[PDB]
RNA sequence: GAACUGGCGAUGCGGGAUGAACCGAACGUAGAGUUAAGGUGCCGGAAUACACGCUCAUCAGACACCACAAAAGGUGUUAGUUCAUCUAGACAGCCGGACGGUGGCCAUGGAAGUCGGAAUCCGCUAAGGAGUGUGUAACAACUCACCGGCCGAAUGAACUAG
RNA sequence: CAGUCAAGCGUUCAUAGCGACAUUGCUUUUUGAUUCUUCGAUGUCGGCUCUUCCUAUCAUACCGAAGCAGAAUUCGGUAAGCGUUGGAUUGUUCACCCACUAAUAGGGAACGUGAGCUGGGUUUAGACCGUCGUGAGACAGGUUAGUUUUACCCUACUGAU
């Protein structure tokens, strides 16, 4: 129906610095800096008071307006991810065969090694995306922690090792073995 | 080959197409064997299935005691009579075709073996090897 | 055996889903329409049948 | 296989790419002007003219005769119709309570509401049922359904056709 | 050959898998209806050989669902890349058994293919039997014997200057 004006709000915390060219966003925070491209949506950007940035679409359709809120959340995750960080706790599930998960570095690639999954002789290697930190955290049995600035790398790599542990030719409703995400939070949560 | 195939064997020249009549080499009381099929054979237009030394076949008795007549039964070929090349480099062949009677598992119906047997067949079916007199 | 605390976590990814009645797709438990073009984004759904 | 009319056969011409039947229009030989049906991105002569909206197809659609598609579906998107809820804080989302009169009256082995059954009114507060579900053989114990806490403006249901 | 609705079957449960009563379609590998082209002739069945194409997928590749514990199985999707046999009987297409295999899926190309083959059948003339007819003769009734012509032209194709 061509909403002549649409507005959603981007709050800017204290310590961060935001640099935005045409559609190239640069967020600078204590934990680092994050950037990406947004030239595929045709939105405008407005700085208000160095603590508040406005995004608007003029004469936008239903799909066009809906895309604006995606950016609102997307750039916000940059701000959250650069101040508090992103932490994805990852849990093993095994019935009979314990799953041996280690870290190996062939050619400096920092691969993730999977063994004994359903007693398989095959070894599954999952590369670690840059900026993602791997933690064989203690005090909780059979869990790994992935931490980083960008939620996308943290989330996708977490999903990557989840998909590499699917079960074939069996009843998944019975063979619940695998690695599944147990907690999504922040590196500096409760701060 | 099949259920009783303990291990693998190298390819050897086929010398027994279907319809061939082959000598019975055990004491089960059969005189000859009539091939009607070969286990593990492929498919092709107009290509007759062929049997070789050590191959399990679906065979039928044409001469023997009546209780062995009129019914089909598995068999294992123990003599080829057609030259084949072993990978050691030698071409060898017996003077006639010979085989035995066995169940689908490879347990030979007979109890003794007359004449020599091929080393490939003996090495592949343990039961045939036990009752074999001379192996080459 | 499998410390059923994890089963709920494990089943939530494998068992706590919903199935499209036309193209057998795996859907989130509270989906309203199937996300697949071939079935026409149909609204006819059934829960994933559970054990026992 | 019949009726009326118009056509082809007996007929060329412009258009329908192409065609006996369709649209336009029927013909001496030439010159000029205007049009019909049909078209004006290029092939192709003529506006990539003006104006208001719809559609993105991981088999779009594109012009009568004509060279095909239906029943049934779709928080795809657009516009509507009829109902309701709403700043006396609408729907969501997150938090708490959810009390006494009176365990209402039978089924009494057991029913405050919950194996069931004829029933069914009050007091406290902004609000909470002689009770919705989980639960106990009953009871509480959880929960809802109602309100309150935040939120601050539209929300839901059904139907219609592009 | 495929849907749409859903009374029921399925221990309970419509839709795991089926599904009546109805109703909407698709295809031209059946058989029909018509006679539009061919009667100064387009060589009719079948088999053999060979190429390609269609997908409504039998198997192989990867997946989804179950009344999927495992194995086996069933339903479905993307999928025509690759393969889909040897025999007994019959002229057979068709059909039925034996056996192997991953499987022995379904079809078109003038019901592909006779100047490519064969001629077993149909389908000339000889002849026999049964039924019918007084008779000559008739019989999608049965049986046996019965000539398969030409490419040096153009194009197409494979090779060659
Ligand atoms: Mg053949
Ligand atoms: Mg005339
Ligand atoms: Mg005229
Ligand atoms: Mg008119
Ligand atoms: Mg021009
Ligand atoms: Mg419709
Ligand atoms: Mg619509
Ligand atoms: Mg005709
Ligand atoms: Mg003719
Ligand atoms: Mg002629
Ligand atoms: Mg001809
Ligand atoms: Mg298909
Ligand atoms: Mg046809
Ligand atoms: Mg052919
Ligand atoms: Mg020809
Ligand atoms: Mg004759
Ligand atoms: Mg005569
Ligand atoms: Mg007579
Ligand atoms: Mg006749
Ligand atoms: Zn679906």
Coordinates of C-alpha atoms (C1' of nucleotides) in Angstrom, one line a residue, chain E residues 58-122:
Chain E
rC58 C1' 12.2 -51.4 -11.5
rA59 C1' 17.3 -50.8 -9.7
rU60 C1' 21.5 -47.7 -8.8
rA61 C1' 22.8 -41.7 -6.4
rC62 C1' 20.8 -38.3 -2.3
rC63 C1' 16.8 -37.4 0.9
rG64 C1' 11.6 -36.9 3.6
rA65 C1' 7.4 -39.9 6.4
rA66 C1' 5.6 -44.7 9.2
rG67 C1' 1.4 -48.7 12.8
rC68 C1' 10.5 -47.1 10.8
rA69 C1' 13.8 -50.8 18.2
rG70 C1' 17.4 -53.7 14.2
rA71 C1' 16.9 -56.3 9.6
rA72 C1' 13.2 -56.4 6.1
rU73 C1' 9.2 -53.4 4.2
rU74 C1' 5.6 -49.4 2.6
rC75 C1' 4.5 -44.2 1.0
rG76 C1' 6.9 -39.8 -1.3
rG77 C1' 10.6 -36.1 -3.7
rU78 C1' 14.8 -34.5 -6.9
rA79 C1' 16.0 -37.6 -10.6
rA80 C1' 16.0 -40.8 -17.7
rG81 C1' 23.2 -40.1 -16.1
rC82 C1' 23.7 -46.1 -16.3
rG83 C1' 21.3 -50.9 -16.6
rU84 C1' 17.2 -53.8 -17.1
rU85 C1' 18.9 -61.1 -18.7
rG86 C1' 19.4 -66.6 -20.2
rG87 C1' 15.7 -70.3 -21.3
rA88 C1' 10.9 -74.5 -21.9
rU89 C1' 5.8 -74.1 -25.0
rU90 C1' 3.3 -71.1 -28.8
rG91 C1' 4.1 -68.0 -35.8
rU92 C1' 2.7 -65.3 -32.2
rU93 C1' 2.0 -59.5 -30.0
rC94 C1' 0.0 -61.5 -25.5
rA95 C1' 0.4 -65.4 -21.9
rC96 C1' 2.6 -69.1 -18.3
rC97 C1' 6.7 -71.4 -15.7
rC98 C1' 12.3 -72.5 -14.7
rA99 C1' 16.8 -69.6 -13.1
rC100 C1' 20.2 -65.8 -12.3
rU101 C1' 20.5 -60.8 -11.1
rA102 C1' 20.5 -54.5 -8.4
rA103 C1' 16.5 -55.0 -11.3
rU104 C1' 14.7 -58.4 -14.8
rA105 C1' 10.0 -50.6 -15.3
rG106 C1' 6.4 -48.9 -18.8
rG107 C1' 6.2 -46.6 -24.0
rG108 C1' 7.2 -43.7 -29.0
rA109 C1' 9.7 -42.9 -33.4
rA110 C1' 4.2 -44.2 -40.5
rC111 C1' 1.1 -49.7 -34.2
rG112 C1' 10.3 -47.4 -35.9
rU113 C1' 12.9 -50.6 -39.0
rG114 C1' 11.3 -56.3 -45.8
rA115 C1' 15.7 -51.9 -52.5
rG116 C1' 18.2 -54.6 -43.8
rC117 C1' 17.1 -60.3 -43.2
rU118 C1' 13.4 -64.5 -42.3
rG119 C1' 8.8 -66.2 -44.0
rG120 C1' 6.5 -69.4 -38.9
rG121 C1' 1.0 -66.9 -39.4
rU122 C1' -2.4 -64.3 -42.1

